[PDB]
Amino acid sequence: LSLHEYMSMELLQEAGVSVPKGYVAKSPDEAYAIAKKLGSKDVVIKAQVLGKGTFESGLKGGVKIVFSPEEAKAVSSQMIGKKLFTKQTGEKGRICNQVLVCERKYPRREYYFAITMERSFQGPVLIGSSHGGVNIEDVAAESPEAIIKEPIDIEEGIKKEQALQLAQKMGFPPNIVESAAENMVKLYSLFLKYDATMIEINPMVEDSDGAVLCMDAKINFDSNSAYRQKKIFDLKDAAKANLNYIGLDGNIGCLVNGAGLAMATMDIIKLHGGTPANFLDVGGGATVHQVTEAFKLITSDKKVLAILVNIFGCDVIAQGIVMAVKDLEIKIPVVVRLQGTRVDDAKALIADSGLKILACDDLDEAARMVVKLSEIVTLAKQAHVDVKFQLPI
Amino acid sequence: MSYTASRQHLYVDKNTKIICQGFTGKQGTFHSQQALEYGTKLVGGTTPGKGGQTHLGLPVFNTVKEAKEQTGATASVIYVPPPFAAAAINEAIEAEIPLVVCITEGIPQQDMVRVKHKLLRQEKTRLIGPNCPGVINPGECKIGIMPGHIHKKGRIGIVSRSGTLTYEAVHQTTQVGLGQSLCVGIGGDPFNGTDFIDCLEIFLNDSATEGIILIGEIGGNAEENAAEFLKQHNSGPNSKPVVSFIAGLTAPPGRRMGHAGAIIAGGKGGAKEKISALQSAGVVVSMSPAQLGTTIYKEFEKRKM
């Protein structure tokens, strides 16, 4: 799980970590109200999408500084209810239904601080750098010496001397190294309490008054810990039906069991000239309702022109696909590839029982089929004709 | 000394005796039924509160220590639910079980970091997993959930971070009549007990293993670490051919791909750098997941094997 920026900043507020004062506006009129409550002058508008991209209304950038409540209402007008489009969102984007209207802070010096579980250290690591306010991957490549990592023993917890030493090496002035270390210790407590996989604060900053303050907060949570994180995980229908699903920009459906095989199925589709439309892992214990909801999810996208299902187990799995195809009135080609118990009886099931479903044995064979069938559909749409398939035995 | 001293416990054989932690549960009972029908010496199991009972004609113990003492088991498989599976691993480590295979997926990453802290400070217990299909010696021993129907005792050692994708490779190697010497699924979690290098040390020292198939994916640096290991210990003359496939070149960054360890974050963990590193180490990387059986085949023919 991940929360909106404001949901994060609320968590560090409850932990004593100082955060710029801000309130959430879900409409342009309440952005005016929040801006007036802040002084009706320098006010920051931060879009909350789950930031340096382009909105659908033409406005580029998600964070804007305005100088009047009237301007705060107008800038939030082109944000709330509109979609943002960044490189991480693909051809589509994320909807913005609310903005964070917080106070403007005037920083002296920006640092970078992060707490993450690194596999190279087999535990939590504190990351610090004097090069804050910028992208962290570019400095890791330009000047890796500016990045300082301090591992934390999971049993003994964080030591005050660890956070103090990192703050000095990060370049904090000596008069506020302690308050910077106290913030870092408070963040490690938040890191373990909510089962976060990474807490990134870019930038951690010194106030114009000299105080240490966290301007931005990105928190990623371990979804495996949802059972013991009721507060966090209470804040499309894939999750509703409990299926590992991620929509992509492609046009070829993908229904696979096993996360590795599902990524491999996406790769082999791209290898044969196609574009995968989604990642989906039905995994073990897949009932008939899973594949029906899996099909309903893939076919919920109009751009999907073909569906390749690749399951390694076979008659009972075939009957579940046949049932879902007939109920949803699926008219796009479906190429199935089943390995397991009864391949001969399952291949005769889909073939000798009605619907136009193609069954393949080889993974490359099924990949070429679903790509060629999608291109036929593409050509039929471009030619503005409808094509009906007739399949061999 | 070093935890790498327990690498030898990965190679189960016909003499390996297994107890099932989580014997009474639905998942533990189901796969224990199969391990008996496959021919593996599943000799007991543990379930707190049900010690002394008889499950599938086999003794049920309350703790792992009682099970190991009264059965002489040298291996353990874990089907405990994620809320308690990490404690099940810790119990087996303290019982000094030589090999423990944790099949459970969904264990909190913070729990495994704690388990990793304890595991790395001992020699007796070697951990496979969690979130792994297990280890199988075709025709001798089978610990886990892999379908032994597709395995044939052969010459290729397989180590993979995936489950069903591992089965696809096993089926491909069998369809070309090569077979498998030892298959180890190290799981798809970010903090596990066995990496690629641990299995490569076993494969490169196994006379029955003439070829190796490494199946990886996005996330982490274990593939790059394996590439450096192979370049220093499997180069020049009398080297064993390694054929690999990395999944996730089409994966979007910053998204978890089912597996808890399949993630591209901060510009690290991409599949392109892993393919680039393995190729530079001499590993033949197959671009299609359907050609790993044929790739290791013609890699054997180019050396008259």
From Swiss-Prot, chain A:
Its main location: mitochondrion. Pfam families: ATP-grasp_2 (PF08442), Ligase_CoA (PF00549). It is found in: Mitochondrion. Pathway: Carbohydrate metabolism; tricarboxylic acid cycle; succinate from succinyl-CoA (ligase route): step 1/1. Mg(2+) binds at residues 202, 216. The modification Phosphotyrosine is found at residue 32. Substrate binds at residue 257. Its EC number is 6.2.1.5. The modification N6-acetyllysine is found at residues 26, 36, 73, 83, 87, 160, 302. It is an enzyme of class 6 (ligase). It catalyses: succinate + ATP + CoA = succinyl-CoA + ADP + phosphate. Its cofactor is Mg(2+). Heterodimer of an alpha and a beta subunit. The beta subunit determines specificity for ATP. Interacts with ALAS2. It is linked to Mitochondrial DNA depletion syndrome 5: A disorder due to mitochondrial dysfunction. It is characterized by infantile onset of hypotonia, neurologic deterioration, a hyperkinetic-dystonic movement disorder, external ophthalmoplegia, deafness, variable renal tubular dysfunction, and mild methylmalonic aciduria in some patients. This is Succinate--CoA ligase [ADP-forming] subunit beta, mitochondrial. It comes from Homo sapiens.
UniProtKB/Swiss-Prot annotation, chain B:
CoA binds at residues 24-27, 50, 103-105. The lineage of its organism: Eukaryota, Metazoa, Chordata, Craniata, Vertebrata. Belongs to the succinate/malate CoA ligase alpha subunit family. Keywords: Acetylation, Disease variant, Ligase, Mitochondrion, Nucleotide-binding, Primary mitochondrial disease, Transit peptide, Tricarboxylic acid cycle. Pathway: Carbohydrate metabolism; tricarboxylic acid cycle; succinate from succinyl-CoA (ligase route): step 1/1. Heterodimer of an alpha and a beta subunit. Different beta subunits determine nucleotide specificity. Together with the ATP-specific beta subunit SUCLA2, forms an ADP-forming succinyl-CoA synthetase (A-SCS). Together with the GTP-specific beta subunit SUCLG2 forms a GDP-forming succinyl-CoA synthetase (G-SCS). It holds the Pfam family Ligase_CoA. This is Succinate--CoA ligase [ADP/GDP-forming] subunit alpha, mitochondrial. The modification N6-succinyllysine is found at residues 17, 26, 298. It is found in: Mitochondrion. It is an enzyme of class 6 (ligase). GO terms for molecular function: nucleotide binding; RNA binding; succinate-CoA ligase (ADP-forming) activity; succinate-CoA ligase (GDP-forming) activity. InterPro entries: Cit_synth/succinyl-CoA_lig_AS, Citrt_syn/SCS-alpha_CS, CoA-bd, CoA_lig_alpha, NAD(P)-bd_dom_sf, SUCC_ACL_C, Succinyl-CoA_synth-like. Substrate binds at residue 167. GO terms for cellular component: mitochondrial matrix; mitochondrion; succinate-CoA ligase complex (ADP-forming); succinate-CoA ligase complex (GDP-forming). The gene is SUCLG1.
